[PDB]
Design a protein around this nucleic acid. Structure first.
Lengths: 51, 60, 124, 167, 323, 148, 210, 44
RNA sequence: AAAAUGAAGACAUUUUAACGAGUAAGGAAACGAAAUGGCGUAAGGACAACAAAAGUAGUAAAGAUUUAAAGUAAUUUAGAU
RNA sequence: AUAAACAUACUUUGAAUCGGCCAAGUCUGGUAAGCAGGACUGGCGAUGCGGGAUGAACCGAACGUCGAGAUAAAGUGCCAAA
RNA sequence: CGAGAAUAGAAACUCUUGAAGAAGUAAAUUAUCUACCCGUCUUGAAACACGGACCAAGGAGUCUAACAUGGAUGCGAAUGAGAAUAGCAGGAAAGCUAUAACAUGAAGAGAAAACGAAAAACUAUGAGAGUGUAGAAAUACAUUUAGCAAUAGUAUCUUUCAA
């Protein structure tokens, strides 16, 4: 398995080391930023705790 | 050029920085100059007791 | 994530009388005079470097981007921080040619390392 | 401020092996760990004596070990210092643990049927210390101590560093 | 003392000999870096040449101070007139074209003494470190491919080496050419005023070929190879086995030199023959390992359990805090 | 090592660790042992209280070779031949061969009596002997020999 | 290394003897190499240059071929009729060329170059027969110890010993405790960097197989 | 300790330094060898 | 200062508590829980792309002028000319 | 009774210093002195900060870098916070 | 009414501004508060005390020798013998080796002649090692044993008119 710190990226045919995989087996992952969950939706009748 | 002769100012403060060094207990237990006859009796007994103690040591 | 880097004094500790005489440089020197206005810590002139001015141990020597500087001279020197790309930032030395700079700049993109000299010695 | 009698200054006790000896560093590592875990005053003592300076760790000869081990037949003398050889007197059979053994002292102890141990073996065999006798050499036998003080003193005169026209 | 075996290789064919050789007892001496530093710090100064400024440099004037009452300082001044030199500064240390501070004399102390038994202690400790692959590589040697870190070659293969093409061939067979090429590829030029005095090239250090008394004709072949230095087994010193005070030099022993080691240095129980009066020292620790003591103490149920410091709670105000 | 001196640590201090009131001047009371009886008399009284005067008779030309007499105590006699020989002749007595300790051949002329001898007969050969030296050698069952 | 104690390895003394050398030693210094056609005819590598020779410039801006028109030994340079520059007002001046940037393609041999070339040729042959006698003597010793091998092995490829016999020595545990902090930290970082490189290589191989 | 140092004269002109010592050995050894070659039983 | 942990992490570890003014003067180097911690000048011996071409350099060194960044500070780092 | 284990006892080696000055519910010589000389303690020297307009010593109080509050000497018509 | 305890219950949010330049930082100017000339001798200097017009480069605790303390190192009744000097490989101001004169020490006192050390020691307090009980987390007591270093005091012995 890949190490937690290894996120392979594609190389534009530029020089690569021996250990770096060739881009045909490298699949990009979309950059992720958000990590918090939005507010839950509750009943129209019940009030929010933050009242 | 007359100078100040002497002052005791700050002398006591200096003496108490490292306080009055009391003598050790060994100073109070010296025996030089004691009574002549008292020392003779003490030497006689210490010689007598040592010889007896050594004699047992050689015996055993 | 990035901690709040707090500096206790953002100015410079200039030498005494450096503003008045051009032979006295601005590099700090503690005044050792017997009547010095500064070493006696007068009002107005009482600004001296002290250990209390030091910044927090957590954020010391940390660049504003939130990473620690790491000088590299070639592409191999980048591999020493490829495991810590979230802590260290590369820094191409001032004597590295423009040809070797492209290899360093390209390789760091492969290894996902932030380079602070990415805009150095660029051609016309 | 606060009226303290005196301010905080470093406590004048050594707590590591002086110098860059790799093996003495490990021995302090071993006994600092043993004293911290076992909480034995023997390991605390050995650790403290391992961190003294060379002048404060005086030698103990085989004659002194023989006399102190006379009524301790099956015991392991433990002295944290170099053990020299007293060629004037014979060496009986005994087990000694010491930092270093003189070439002649090791042969004399071995040839008599005894054993020469190191401190790592002693910790392996007797970590808390059960059949051991703690021994240290004499400190006042140094010749430097003769010249300390005032040679004009009426009670305990010094000994007059020799020099120009000393009679 | 089981003293594990050491294999001897053929330099030409690459074939290990059928008769192993026991490791000499000199490879188990304590590796004291502080003792080596004391000896190397002294011995490195023994090659220095005497130097000194001219005894009469800056004192070749008949100058005297002008004195006070002339609005000029009291430093002595050159006598006469008619040139720019007259009336200028004089012998004084701060003046131009005068003598300096306390001038350097050619009878200074150049060479340093060192006791013989301390010098022999350092060589034994430096030989021991040459058999530790971790210390050898950490010094800057490429020993990844060599078969045995106490590298020994046959005395038969050594006797046939007469040209530098053969010595290079042997160095390739025993996988020792990685260090030679590291020196070749990394040769450069000195940075500073050392080039004026003649010191221009600055090369690295490579393998050291230690040979015996029967390999005096193979020395000529190895000498021209860049980054290869040869030494006789008897003439070893800290200047060879720890250049720059970094112990752990990569050494290529020969069969004649490897076997003479036991006679030259002796064992930890036998006095040396080649170096009279010297015996290998015993380390402060019989087994320089702490794990075996901890587990035995653990097995005897003596050590307490590991302690994690409790989290000391922060101070609260009971009058204002109900909890 | 000039970089470990105190001059490198006192750079920036004006007086270089010698005082402002009392400067570092050329002399501090004279050159050499000057003023041995005038102002450094408290020094000589305190630390060398017999420096000035005369004692004993002069030897116009001392023959230092006539006083040469290395000494060895009785307890150290057996170390001249070693412990291997000492144990080998351990069970000897009058009548058979007993080792001879040549003190002179080892550079020792006089034999003194200090400490205790091992309980074995021995023949001690030396130039001079002490009263207690001969007593201890003879009380163990041995003999004393003269030389030169 | 240099083992003759008469000659000096001092750069400053070497340059001084170059500037102050007389005309006799300046001629033997400004030598040029013969071309292939001339080398094959005479079996001589290089000879001191001479006027009216024809040379061919091999290094510089213009690799023209001309005739030697001036052998200036004070400046240590030569002149060619084909390499000139116009001196602004119109007259052309020759361009100085170092003799080590040209090769001779046509000699000017009157009577003593012929004697020199014969002497230069025989010296080459005489040394060759001496080197041959040494190499045979060196080879005769090699076949006495390794009768099954021939001396051509030294010119071909070399196969390293792949056997990896390890040795047990009771100091490898202490290795980490015998380095100073600067060399311990570098040693540990090299281990960490090497391990991570192997981790990436292992991951790549798994992807390649799959 | 009372010091007794005799540096009150011009010791700088009295200093003798041994920089020729490593070449006395080569001189004496070579001459010693030269004697053996000339007539061997003279260096005998 | 005391407890805990400790072959290598790292920020010269973790926690708790007390303390921090200063002329003359002292605290040399080394010492894993380190018997004060560091910056700079020049030269000498090593190390510097670990897989057989192994620190930087005419794709622009040293130096000089400035703009910014790191450090309480000595100073260091980088950009532009 | 109270305090005291980073308590206590020190040993060795050594630096600088022995021109001092001020105060006072103190003294001596003097008409007197911001004079000369002493006993006890505290300070200035070596010392900045708040107050006395200003000041080597007076009053409060002694200083790592900052935030928030309660204060000390002393003040609250304006300069000047009250 | 109600402590302990047993049994069940519940906290995840909004708005504004920011590559049309947020927060921070820097430079210049302005405004409130604030700031006497550095070095030095001195009880006391911003002083109507002296040196200093400005800038660059140079500029001052060093070297040799004897002793002592002290921290790291080797060996240890020995240590050193890189005393001269003599050999070895290599070509070498480097390196290696030399049963060795001597230096310091192992014996001390006396001006010197003449001498030259045990009762195989004693007493005191002191480092360490166990067992049992209990608190009960660590730890606190009872008891058995050894008594090193250090200090002090004793006998005994060598030398001195005198220790």
């Amino acid at each position: 398995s890949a190490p937690q710190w290894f996120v392979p990226v594609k190389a534009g045919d530029a020089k690569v080391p021996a250990y770096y995989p060739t881009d045909d087996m490298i699949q990009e992952q979309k950059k992720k930023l958000r990590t918090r969950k939005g507010a839950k939706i509750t009943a129209l009748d019940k009030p929010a705790w933050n009242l | 050029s007359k100078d100040k002769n002497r002052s005791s100012h700050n002398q006591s403060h200096k003496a108490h920085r490292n306080g009055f060094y009391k003598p050790k207990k060994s100073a109070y237990m010296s025996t030089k100059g004691m009574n002549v006859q008292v020392l003779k009796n003490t030497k006689a007994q210490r010689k007598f007791a040592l010889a007896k103690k050594l004699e047992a040591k050689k015996a055993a | 994530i990035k901690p709040k880097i707090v500096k206790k004094y953002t100015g410079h500790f200039k030498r005494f009388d450096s503003n008045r005489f051009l032979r006295v440089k601005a590099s700090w020197r503690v005044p050792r005079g017997i009547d010095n206005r500064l070493r006696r810590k007068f009002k107005g002139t009482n600004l001296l470097p002290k250990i209390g001015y030091g910044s927090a141990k957590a954020t010391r020597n940390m660049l504003p981007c939130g990473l620690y500087k790491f000088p590299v001279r070639n592409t191999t020197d980048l591999e020493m921080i490829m495991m810590q790309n979230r802590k260290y930032a590369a820094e191409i030395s001032h004597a590295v040619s423009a040809k070797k700079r492209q290899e360093i700049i390209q390789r760091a993109k492969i290894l996902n390392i932030r380079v602070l000299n990415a805009d150095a010695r660029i051609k016309k | 401020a606060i009226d303290l009698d005196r301010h905080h200054v470093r406590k004048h006790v050594s707590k590591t092996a002086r110098g860059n000896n790799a093996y003495m560093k490990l021995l302090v590592r071993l006994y600092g760990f043993l004293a911290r875990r076992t909480q034995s005053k023997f390991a605390k003592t050995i650790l403290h004596r391992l961190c003294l300076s060379r002048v404060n760790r005086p030698i103990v000869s085989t004659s002194k070990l023989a006399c102190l081990m006379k009524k301790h037949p099956e015991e392991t003398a433990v002295c944290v210092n170099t053990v020299t050889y007293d060629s004037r007197y014979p060496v009986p059979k005994m087990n000694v643990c010491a930092l270093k053994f003189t070439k002649t002292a090791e042969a004399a102890i071995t040839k008599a049927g005894g054993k020469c141990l190191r401190f790592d073996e002693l910790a392996l065999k007797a970590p808390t210390g059960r059949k051991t006798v703690l021994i240290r050499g004499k400190r006042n036998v140094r010749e430097a101590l003769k010249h300390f003080g005032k040679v004009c003193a009426k009670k305990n005169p010094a000994k007059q560093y020799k020099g120009k026209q000393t009679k | 003392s089981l003293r594990p075996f050491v294999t001897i290789y053929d330099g030409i064919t690459g074939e290990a000999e059928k008769t192993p050789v026991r490791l000499p007892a000199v490879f188990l001496a304590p590796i004291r870096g502080d003792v080596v530093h004391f000896v190397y710090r002294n011995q490195s100064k023994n090659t220095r040449q005497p130097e000194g400024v001219s005894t009469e440099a800056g004192k070749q004037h008949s100058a005297i101070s002008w004195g006070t009452g002339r609005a000029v300082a009291r430093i002595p001044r050159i006598s006469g007139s008619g040139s720019g030199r007259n009336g200028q500064g004089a012998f004084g240390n701060m003046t131009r074209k005068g003598h300096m501070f306390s001038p350097l004399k050619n009878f200074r102390k150049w060479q340093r003494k060192t006791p013989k038994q301390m010098r022999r202690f350092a060589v034994a400790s430096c030989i021991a470190a040459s058999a530790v692959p971790a210390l050898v590589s950490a010094r800057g040697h490429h020993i990844a491919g060599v078969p045995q870190i106490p590298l020994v070659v046959n005395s038969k293969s050594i006797s046939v080496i007469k040209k530098t093409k053969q010595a290079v061939y042997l160095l390739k067979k025993i996988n020792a050419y990685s260090d030679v090429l590291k020196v070749i590829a990394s040769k450069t030029v000195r940075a500073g005023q050392g080039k004026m005095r003649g010191r221009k090239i600055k090369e690295r250090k490579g393998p050291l070929v230690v040979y015996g008394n029967d390999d005096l004709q193979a020395v000529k072949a190895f000498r021209n190879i860049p980054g290869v230095d040869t030494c006789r087994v008897e003439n070893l010193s800290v200047l060879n086995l720890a250049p720059g005070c970094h112990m752990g030099r990569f050494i290529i022993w020969t069969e004649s030199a490897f076997k003479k080691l036991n006679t030259i240095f002796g064992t930890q129980k036998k006095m040396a023959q080649g170096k009279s009066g010297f015996r290998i020292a015993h380390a402060q620790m019989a087994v320089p390992d702490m794990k075996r003591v901890v587990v035995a103490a653990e097995k005897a149920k003596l050590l307490r359990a590991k302690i994690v410091l409790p989290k000391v709670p922060k101070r609260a105000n009971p009058l204002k805090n109900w909890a | 090592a000039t970089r470990f001196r105190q001059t490198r640590r006192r750079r920036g201090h004006v007086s270089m660790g010698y005082g402002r009131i009392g400067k570092h001047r050329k002399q501090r009371g004279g050159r050499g042992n000057a003023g041995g009886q005038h102002h450094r008399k408290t020094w000589f009284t305190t630390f060398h209280p017999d420096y000035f005067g005369k004692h004993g008779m002069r030897v116009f030309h001392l023959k230092a070779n006539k006083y040469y007499c290395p000494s060895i105590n009785v307890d150290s006699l057996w170390s001249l031949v070693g412990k291997d020989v000492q144990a080998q002749y351990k069970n000897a007595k009058v009548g058979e061969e007993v080792p001879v300790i040549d003190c002179v051949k080892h550079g020792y002329f006089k034999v003194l009596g200090k400490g205790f001898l091992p309980k074995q007969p021995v023949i001690v050969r030396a130039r001079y002997f002490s009263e207690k030296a001969q007593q201890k050698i003879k009380a163990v069952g041995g003999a004393c020999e003269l030389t030169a | 290394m240099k083992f003759n104690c008469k000659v000096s390895s001092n750069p400053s003394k070497a340059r001084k003897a170059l500037y102050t050398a007389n005309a006799s030693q300046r001629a033997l210094m400004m030598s040029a190499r013969l071309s292939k056609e001339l080398r094959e005819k005479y079996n001589v590598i290089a000879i001191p240059i001479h006027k009216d020779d024809e040379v061919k410039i091999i290094k510089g801006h213009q690799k023209v071929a001309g005739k030697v028109t001036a052998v200036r030994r004070s400046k240590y340079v030569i002149n060619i009729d084909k390499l000139t520059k116009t001196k602004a007002n119109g007259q052309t001046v020759p361009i100085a060329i170092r003799p080590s940037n040209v090769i001779i393609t046509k000699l000017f041999l009157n009577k003593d170059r012929e004697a020199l070339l014969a002497k230069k040729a025989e010296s080459r042959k005489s040394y060759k027969e001496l080197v041959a006698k040494r190499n045979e003597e060196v080879a005769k010793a090699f076949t006495a110890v390794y009768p099954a091998l021939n001396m051509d092995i030294f010119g071909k490829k070399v196969e390293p010993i792949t056997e990896k016999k390890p040795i047990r020595i009771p100091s490898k545990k202490m290795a980490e405790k015998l380095m100073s902090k600067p060399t311990l930290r570098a040693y540990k970082t090299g281990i960490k960097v090497h391990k991570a490189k192997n981790a990436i290589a292992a991951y790549k191989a798994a992807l390649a197989k799959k | 300790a009372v010091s007794n140092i005799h540096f009150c004269k011009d010791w700088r002109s009295k200093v003798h330094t041994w920089f020729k010592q490593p070449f006395r050995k080569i001189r004496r050894h070579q001459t010693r060898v030269e004697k053996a070659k000339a007539v061997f039983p003279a260096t005998i």
